Design an enzyme around this catalytic site. Structure first.
Site, PDB file in Angstrom:
ATOM      1  N   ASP A 149      20.685  12.932  -7.690  1.00 48.35           N
ATOM      2  CA  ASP A 149      20.967  11.647  -8.569  1.00 48.35           C
ATOM      3  C   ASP A 149      22.475  12.446  -9.186  1.00 48.35           C
ATOM      4  O   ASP A 149      22.752  13.451  -9.637  1.00 48.35           O
ATOM      5  CB  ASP A 149      20.540  12.556  -9.770  1.00 48.35           C
ATOM      6  CG  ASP A 149      19.748  11.610 -10.836  1.00 48.35           C
ATOM      7  OD1 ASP A 149      21.046  11.212 -11.805  1.00 48.35           O
ATOM      8  OD2 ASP A 149      19.021  10.238 -10.937  1.00 48.35           O
ATOM      9  N   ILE A 150      22.953  11.332  -9.379  1.00 47.66           N
ATOM     10  CA  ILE A 150      24.670  11.015 -10.593  1.00 47.66           C
ATOM     11  C   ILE A 150      24.680  11.334 -11.081  1.00 47.66           C
ATOM     12  O   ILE A 150      26.159  11.488 -12.107  1.00 47.66           O
ATOM     13  CB  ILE A 150      25.209  10.273  -9.615  1.00 47.66           C
ATOM     14  CG1 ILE A 150      24.363   8.520 -10.153  1.00 47.66           C
ATOM     15  CG2 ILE A 150      25.546   9.684  -8.017  1.00 47.66           C
ATOM     16  CD1 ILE A 150      25.857   7.497 -10.149  1.00 47.66           C
ATOM     17  N   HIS A 187      10.046   5.946  -7.507  1.00 47.80           N
ATOM     18  CA  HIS A 187      11.405   7.267  -7.023  1.00 47.80           C
ATOM     19  C   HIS A 187      10.363   8.545  -7.955  1.00 47.80           C
ATOM     20  O   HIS A 187       9.838   8.673  -8.942  1.00 47.80           O
ATOM     21  CB  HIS A 187      12.917   7.390  -7.489  1.00 47.80           C
ATOM     22  CG  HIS A 187      12.709   7.749  -9.121  1.00 47.80           C
ATOM     23  ND1 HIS A 187      13.615   7.242  -9.795  1.00 47.80           N
ATOM     24  CD2 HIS A 187      13.947   8.759  -9.176  1.00 47.80           C
ATOM     25  CE1 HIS A 187      13.806   7.390 -11.000  1.00 47.80           C
ATOM     26  NE2 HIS A 187      13.754   8.919 -10.919  1.00 47.80           N
ATOM     27  N   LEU A 188      10.454   9.865  -6.738  1.00 45.42           N
ATOM     28  CA  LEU A 188      10.245  11.330  -6.934  1.00 45.42           C
ATOM     29  C   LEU A 188      11.167  12.141  -7.513  1.00 45.42           C
ATOM     30  O   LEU A 188      11.824  12.577  -6.763  1.00 45.42           O
ATOM     31  CB  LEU A 188       9.498  11.117  -6.295  1.00 45.42           C
ATOM     32  CG  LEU A 188       8.769  13.132  -6.907  1.00 45.42           C
ATOM     33  CD1 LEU A 188       7.263  13.060  -7.553  1.00 45.42           C
ATOM     34  CD2 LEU A 188       8.550  13.806  -5.796  1.00 45.42           C
TER      35      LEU A 188
END
Lengths: 116, 115
Positions: free
Chosen positions: B32-33, B101-102
């Site tokens: 994740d950004i 998403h997970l």
């Protein structure tokens, strides 16, 4: 403090102690969390004693997905229309409270970011 | 289109770069950004499921696969002290992208409740 390798969730599955059961089938059990953190807050657990997601086997894959399908179905039938959050806690840092795998579903309020 | 019409579809199709941890025929895991923990990544299905709420019963082994991939990636990124996996559904769940998403977060103490 667990001399049988077993947990409170095993007692719940065995109906040895009461719980607020939402749903049951051959392989899982859904019930309301006894310490709710949202207007709706419930657990979907496998009947198979998997102590933590970190030790789940590849063959448990469809069982784990089953927890999530059961979760979304229970959410719909508990009146969650505006959304919810599904959570699996692993270990000390994840805040795992019981060493029996459980998918928590929380809703009925705005869930915030970060998720803990 | 393969992967759907969200940002996640662009990532699946490799149209925009991501720091990919793992890929197979069913899913993709990447960092994740906007991390909310020292380690924070996503596992997404390549099949465009827009929301867990509209997943079909058929999707069960794919959803479990996301969770197995998640725990395997967590182990490979050194999260030996634990982590939290999260699926956000809809407005109250804080879902932004309409592709399921997970999320996996670790490397710090996670607090209760989870938001």
């Amino acid at each position: 403090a667990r001399p049988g390798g077993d947990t409170i969730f095993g007692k719940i599955i065995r109906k040895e102690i009461p719980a607020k059961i939402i749903f049951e089938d051959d392989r899982c059990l859904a019930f309301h969390d006894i310490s709710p953190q949202a207007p709706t807050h419930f657990l979907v657990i496998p009947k198979k004693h998997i102590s933590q997601i970190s030790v789940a086997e590849d063959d448990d894959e469809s069982l784990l997905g089953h927890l999530m399908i059961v979760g979304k179905k229970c959410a719909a039938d508990l009146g969650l229309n505006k959304g919810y959050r599904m959570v699996v806690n692993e270990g000390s840092d994840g805040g795992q409270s019981v060493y029996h795998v459980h998918l928590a579903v929380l809703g009925g309020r705005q869930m915030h970011w970060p998720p803990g």
